[PDB]
Every structure is written in structure tokens, then in C-alpha cells.
Amino acid sequence: HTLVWGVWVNGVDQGDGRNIYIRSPPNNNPVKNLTSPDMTCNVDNRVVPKSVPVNAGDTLTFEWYHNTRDDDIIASSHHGPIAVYIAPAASNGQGNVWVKLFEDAYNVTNSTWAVDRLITAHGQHSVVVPHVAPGDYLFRAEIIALHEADSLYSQNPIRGAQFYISCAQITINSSDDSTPLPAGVPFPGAYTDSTPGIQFNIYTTPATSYVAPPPSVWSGALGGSIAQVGDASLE
Numbered sequence: 001h002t003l004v005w006g007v008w009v010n011g012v013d014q015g016d017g018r019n020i021y022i023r024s025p026p027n028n029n030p031v032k033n034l035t036s037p038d039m040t041c042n043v044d045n046r047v048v049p050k051s052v053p054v055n056a057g058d059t060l061t062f063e064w065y066h067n068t069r070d071d072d073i074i075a076s077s078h079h080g081p082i083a084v085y086i087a088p089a090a091s092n093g094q095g096n097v098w099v100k101l102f103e104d105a106y107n108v109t110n111s112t113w114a115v116d117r118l119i120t121a122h123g124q125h126s127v128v129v130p131h132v133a134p135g136d137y138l139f140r141a142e143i144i145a146l147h148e149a150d151s152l153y154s155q156n157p158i159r160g161a162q163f164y165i166s167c168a169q170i171t172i173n174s175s176d177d178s179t180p181l182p183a184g185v186p187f188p189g190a191y192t193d194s195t196p197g198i199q200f201n202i203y204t205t206p207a208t209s210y211v212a213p214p215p216s217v218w219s220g221a222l223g224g225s226i227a228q229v230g231d232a233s234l235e
């Protein structure tokens with residue numbers, strides 16, 4: 001159970017983004033229904049009044065929290081991967097538009113899931129803004145908690161993979177559009193019950209065997225990292 005507070009750009013806090021430049025749902029409940037429109041940008045997908053200005057090569061940092069800013073972030077039980085996608089704002093996230101900028105599942109060296117490292121990073125994970133066409137965009141940050149993913153939601157609706165999905169309105173101003181955005185996947189639609197990484201038993205399968213859901217990260221991406229860039233407690 002986790003939500004996005006706001007973003008940082010190049011290590012600078014852009015301020016509380018909730019219902020402002022983040023298309024915030026009303027609470028931190030997970031999405032589980034792979035076929036639901038809620039898979040696109042969570043349960044209250046509507047235009048919010050601000051869009052954060054960035055330039056290609058900027059570091060865009062999502063900041064997550066559980067109940068209050070810079071708390072325990074997400075329950076330690078919620079082991080799983082983290083991905084970031086991008087689509088043009090004109091789509092409203094509909095169609096084959098979502099391009100993967102970032103993937104992190106399991107780190108064999110540190111023996112830690114993306115979520116484990118997200119807690120250590122005080123909820124902060126980043127992408128580098130790509131050299132796409134100037135204009136308005138949706139950045140879709142997705143945490144998959146796998147603690148009940150031995151079941152499929154489609155089969156047992158009280159279990160299944162849990163999706164914490166947040167869409168940020170981002171305006172890319174300065175960009176040479178040298179890496180124009182290629183074709184995207186649909187949400188809902190990219191993830192199905194047979195998709196690798198959707199049904200997984202983190203209690204019996206080695207984390208080293210985990211494969212995260214496709215698609216693969218775009219070659220045009222520059223992203224990106226799970227790591228604290230700023231200290232919220234200094235404000």
C-alpha cells in the first residue's frame with residue numbers, strides 16, 4: 001500500500017503533487033484486475049491542473065510514501081519489481097502507447113528486490129528524461145507487490161499480484177527529438193495471466209529465477225535508478 005507524494009527534477013523537489021501534477025487515486029489500495037481501465041493510471045484517471053516542466057537529460061525522481069511523507073514507504077512484505085513507462089498525453093494512456101524507460105526486479109549481489117531498495121531510498125526512484133518530441137507526457141510508475149502473486153486475481157479475487165500505479169503529468173520543453181518515441185504497449189492489455197512475472201511464488205522460487213513482465217526497456221531510455229536524491233526531512 002503506497003502512493004506518490006510528488007517528484008524531484010535534477011535533485012530539486014517540485015512540491016506536493018497530489019491531485020496537482022499526479023493523477024492521484026483517493027487511497028493507497030492496490031489495483032489487481034489486469035483487464036480493468038484502472039491498470040492505465042489507477043482508479044481516478046483525469047487531467048489534473050499542473051504538468052511538471054523538464055528537459056531531455058534531466059533526472060525525474062518519483063517519491064512514494066505509505067501514510068505520511070518519508071515514512072516506512074511500503075510494507076517490507078511487498079517484495080517485487082519496479083518499472084516506469086512513458087506515453088504522450090494526447091493518448092490519455094489508451095492504445096499501444098506505453099514505452100518502458102526503467103526495469104528493476106531482483107539484485108543478486110545485494111540479495112534485494114526493487115521494493116526493498118525503494119524503502120532504503122526513502123521512496124525515491126528516478127529516470128533520465130529521454131530525447132523524445134517536446135510536448136506533454138504521462139510517466140507511469142508501477143510497483144508490483146508479489147506477496148500474494150502465487151494466485152491469479154482472475155481465478156481468486158482475494159489474492160494476486162498487486163499493482164501500485166501512479167501517472168505524473170510531465171511537460172518536456174527542451175529536446176532535439178533525436179530518439180522519437182517508438183510504438184507502445186497497452187495498459188490494460190500488456191499483462192495477462194500467462195505473462196512472465198505476474199504469477200510467481202516468492203516463498204518457494206529463488207528470486208534469481210524471477211523474470212519481470214515484458215516489455216523490455218526501450219534502447220532509447222537513459223534511466224535510471226532506485227536511490228534517494230533529496231532529503232524530504234530538510235523542508
Ligand SMILES: *[C@@H]1O[C@H](CO)[C@@H](O)[C@H](O)[C@H]1NC(C)=O
Nearest residue numbers: 033034035036037038153157
Ligand atoms: C475486471 O475488469 C473487467 C474490465 O473492466 C471487468 O469486466 C470485470 O468485471 C472485473 N473483475 C472484477 C472481479 O471486478
Ligand SMILES: [Cu+2]
Nearest residue numbers: 001002075078
Ligand atoms: Cu499493501
